[PDB]
Amino acid sequence: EVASYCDRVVAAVEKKLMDSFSPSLSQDKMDGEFAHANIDGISIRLCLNKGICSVFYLDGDKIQSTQLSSKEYNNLLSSLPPKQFNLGKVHTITAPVSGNFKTHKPAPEVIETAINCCTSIIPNDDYFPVKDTDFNSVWHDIYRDIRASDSNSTKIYFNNIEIPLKLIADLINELGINEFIDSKKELQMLSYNQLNKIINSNFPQQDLCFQTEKLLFTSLFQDPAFISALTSAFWQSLHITSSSVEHIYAQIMSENIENRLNFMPENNCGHIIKINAVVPGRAYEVSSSILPSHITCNGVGINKIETSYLVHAGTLPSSEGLRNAIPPESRQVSFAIISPD
Secondary structure, X not given: OOOOOHHHHHOOOOOOOHHHEEEOOOOOOOOOEEEEEEEOOEEEEEEEEOOEEEEXXXXXXXXXXXXXXXXXXXXXHHHOOOXXXXXXXXXXXXXXXXXXXXXXXXXXXXXXXXXXXXEEEXXXXXXXXXXXXXXXOHXXXXXXXXXXXXXXXXXXXXXXXXXXXXXXXXXXXXXXOOOOXXXXXXXXXXXXXXHHHHHHHHOOOOOHHHHHHHHHHHHHOOOHHHHHHHHHOOOOOOOOOEHHHHHHHHHHHHHHHHHHHHHOOOOOOOEEEEEEEEOOOOEEEEEEEEOOEEEOOOOEEEEEEEEEEEEOOOOOOOXXXXXXXXXXXXXXXXXXXXXXX
């Protein structure tokens, strides 16, 4: 009753509805189930079976419906939430805008659909052991990325609260990450004094809402686990975790070259990091989507590569603690292509 075909809305084009949809994990799943949504006794299952996508309304509660979709399935994929699903191939999502082989950069409605679209998981199997070199670049990586940050190409969230860019810049400075810093060094933490001072100059205001945000941030920025989680999302090769992935990545980088060459002969694009605390001090689930520029054939699009992991409660901020706490074996990687029109 609640959403009888209110989903048939989505499958043929306010969407707070979509985020009920989660990656269907458990073994109670249906066959080919890749997502599910629990809503008003209703439970919607999304299935895939050899390239074809079934929906299971299947629930007034003893009631079951089911259709099969064609390129209404393409519509479905775009209305999906920014989560890592078990689709088959790496999928391609078209932003609303005709392509342009002139422009230096990605259409901003391409940048938008890249941020808000879902990614398909790339099943690792051949997990890489941990090299002694893992995460060495990390400090430097954050330093560079943040300095060239664009407040709308790169955004950082904690439990869905947006931490201001220019506040995390002030953070890393106070922690010691400059050009002059040793890739190896474990990071001295900060004092209540030290960081209380920076959350105040980045919320110069004294609104009542900020006042609570500031309590969290004040006490988050003192957790080692947390600055570990935060800095790691920036390591340049975070997503290179298996041959299976390396295969997809390479296929893509190549397809990017061959396109730039057949369409526009003669970059940077940043990070969307989402960090949530969770039940093991306290442990953090992190997600670091990166948005490299990727030439599609309708013009200049982007390749979203999202990689997520668990920074466990202990974890201390060094290239050492990081590479051990976040072994390749434990990162999960998914791709999307976002192309203009």
